[PDB]
């Protein structure tokens, strides 16, 4: 079996940069190595078959190079929409084997994340437990931490989303602290805290209580 | 255009066999320089190689996967299925189809079907639409929040629709795994404010393979008569 290695495993690089990819395979492959482009939650996409043949539709701003061992794709200008992950793939012998991906992030400026707290539906009223929501959005980079707090001390019974991609070049995330009905309906107060390196002083808080 | 699409049940409980049939359209499957071929890629995962099968009938599997693995050809309803045999939690992935193409490898891909072994039971989602909030409503967009929560398996598909019509412009968070084993997700639609302060009705359709006809819908609107 032939071990696939790719390098670097994560990388950001900005709008127009040149990204490069190195793939090496632990035996000779000669010109048999493809690459792939899978977009989070997509299928991969064929971008490159032998190892410098463009597939039809494919950009021309993507490139391979590479014979024997040591591989290289190279995206000449990156533009937004190359945000995936992408994957080398020998097809020598069997059994044939991928690389181990490299996500290919959008290295942009900081931007302030905004912070919303979301009372529980009405409909969820008829349990025993109510969900408080608190939606975290617009912020950049991904790097967030998000607690939950009530007259001081934490809260443990809560749960985050990891950061989702959103149509701008953001993130956002929704964080959800699950109380006991009857806590919520005396009316105690609750706190979302955000820690993110584009606030001011690198935190900042919401409260959510009944009205 | 060649197009492929794969189907079989998204659940299997262990030690059972997992079957999946990917049915090829647009082209023949009967046709010598194609490979067709099975990939799966476990969550947060690479894609692992299981095998393929040419229309004569032949076949190469994985040698991991071997004694397990079966895949075969049916020639008359343009299909090849996977029968994957003794399955444990480490056969929980999204599976692929695909074809090798003469030039390379792997020039068209199957949607992708992700199934989940595992010995629990189906839990039904339950869906809650949550209004933007009042600090949101100073901005020219504004959030409606569509919150599911307490379902098993993970596959769910979650789609925004009003008067009938599809809604694009929403993003869903991927599956997050709560405290008592379920699942639970986020679908956020960004809407105009004006929209939602005239009174405009959004739904939110979410389909699982434990509610009552795969479907279930719920409203979410400033209803302004109140």
């Known amino acids: 079996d032939i071990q696939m290695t790719q390098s670097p495993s994560s990388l950001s690089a900005s709008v127009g940069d040149r990204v490069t990819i190195t793939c090496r395979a632990s035996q000779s492959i000669s010109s048999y190595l493809n690459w792939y482009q899978q977009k989070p939650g997509k299928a991969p996409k064929l971008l490159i078959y032998?190892?410098?043949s463009l597939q039809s539709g494919v950009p021309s701003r993507f490139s391979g190079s590479g014979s024997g061992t040591d591989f290289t794709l190279t995206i000449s200008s990156l533009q937004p929409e190359d945000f995936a992950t992408y994957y080398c793939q020998q097809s020598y012998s069997t059994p044939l084997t991928f690389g181990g991906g490299t996500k290919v992030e959008i290295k942009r400026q900081p931007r302030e994340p905004q912070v919303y707290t979301l009372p529980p539906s009405r409909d969820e009223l008829t349990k025993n437990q109510v969900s408080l929501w608190c939606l975290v959005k617009g912020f950049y980079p991904s790097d967030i931490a998000v607690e939950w707090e009530s007259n001081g001390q934490p809260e443990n019974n809560y749960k985050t989303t990891p950061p989702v991609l959103d149509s701008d070049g953001s993130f956002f995330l929704y964080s959800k602290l699950t109380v006991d009905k009857s806590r919520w309906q005396q009316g105690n107060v609750f706190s979302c805290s955000v820690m993110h390196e584009a606030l001011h002083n690198h935190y900042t808080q919401k409260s959510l209580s009944l009205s | 255009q060649v197009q492929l699409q794969e189907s079989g049940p998204g659940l299997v409980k262990p030690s059972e066999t997992l079957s999946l049939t990917c049915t090829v359209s647009g082209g023949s499957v009967s046709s010598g320089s194609y490979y067709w071929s099975w990939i799966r890629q476990p969550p947060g995962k690479g894609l692992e190689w299981i095998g393929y099968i040419y229309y004569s009938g032949s076949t190469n599997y994985n040698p991991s996967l071997k004694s397990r693995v079966t895949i075969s050809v049916d020639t008359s309803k343009n299909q090849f299925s996977l029968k994957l045999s003794s399955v444990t939690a480490a056969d929980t992935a999204v599976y692929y189809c695909?074809?090798?193409?003469?030039?390379?490898?792997?020039?068209?891909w199957g949607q992708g079907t992700m199934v989940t072994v595992s010995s629990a039971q189906p839990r039904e989602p339950q869906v809650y639409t949550l209004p933007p909030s009042r600090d949101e409503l100073t901005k020219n967009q504004v959030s409606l929040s569509c919150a599911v929560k307490g379902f098993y398996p993970s596959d769910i598909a979650v789609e925004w629709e009003s008067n009938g019509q599809p809604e694009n412009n929403y993003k869903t968070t991927p599956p997050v795994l709560d405290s008592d084993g379920s699942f639970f997700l986020v679908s956020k639609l960004t809407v105009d404010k004006s929209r939602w302060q005239q009174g405009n009705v959004f739904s939110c359709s979410v389909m699982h393979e434990a509610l009552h006809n795969h479907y279930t819908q719920k409203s979410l609107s400033l209803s302004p008569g109140k």
């Open positions: 695909a074809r090798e193409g003469k030039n390379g490898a792997f020039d068209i």
């Open positions: 032998a190892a410098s």
